[PDB]
Amino acid sequence: SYYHHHHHHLSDFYDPRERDPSVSRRPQNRQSDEWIRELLLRGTIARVATLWQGEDGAAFPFITPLAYAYRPEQGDLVYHTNVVGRLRANAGQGHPATLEVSEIGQFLPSNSPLELSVQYRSVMVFGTARVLAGEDARAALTTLSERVFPGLKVGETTRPISEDDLKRTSVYSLSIDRWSGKENWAEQAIQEEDWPALGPEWLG
Template structure:
């Protein structure tokens, strides 16, 4: 597992020798409104990954990890970009962590009111939350003739982000 931050970060510099860490990621899928405050909830997906975080100093591993950050969302794009500059690499700390343990949790259900509350006259239900791609906003300084590449077609206005990411990976792997 890799992530990155500023080389000026004191917190990240403290990882130099390696330190036990927990990286947690959560994604909100819906707001659950019940008939009592106690039974309000949220639908979500979350993961907690445990391991020893360390700074990646080896230049090839660091560059590969930084390319992976870009390619996770836009497969193959790092190959089309200008190479990272020495200053950019110096300004970026890359942290790596082998996942030693992990835990995941999902809540994906409706209202869980107490039986006696179902007769209370107040609206209850789930309000879904989605990450949706908006309309592309081309840079006003694009060179003449530079078009949006076909491998970004999945990032269409109105498409759910999870579907766009999946399509980008499958297209890159030649499965679509």
């Protein structure tokens, strides 16, 4: 800054900057529903958080990383997992679930400590997950398998999914209520001009 430069020889926020008119004006790094759809379509790993009853009677969240597929017409995401707790902290046949998908890029160094950060795109989905049965479960597992292994075809590449297979697997549909998307994928963190610049070891 001038103040610092002048002091050595002896605000930013409202000053000129370049802006691309095409870029999101949404606050807090928020993204459009179409952006959310596209990220969900190209991802293959999610975390799912669901609530289970703990030793103290209190509900607490599990987090499970798992393969998933988004089925846009159905309005759901499908996955399979035999992870359970003791009792779910939930009434009924479906359970509330939060699912997260992200693309994590590089850590972004700075000579300003609170500008240190990591590139990310992240979607949170809120919905209700239910266990599928029979042909519903077979079709969902098929869509999942063929999504996460491009080119694989159940019944050709693999043997068909049998009734035994289905009895051994818990297959879920998470029906979407709402979702949230967020991106902060800068090429460089904000730097502090009034401290020595990071060397080439960092931004090189």
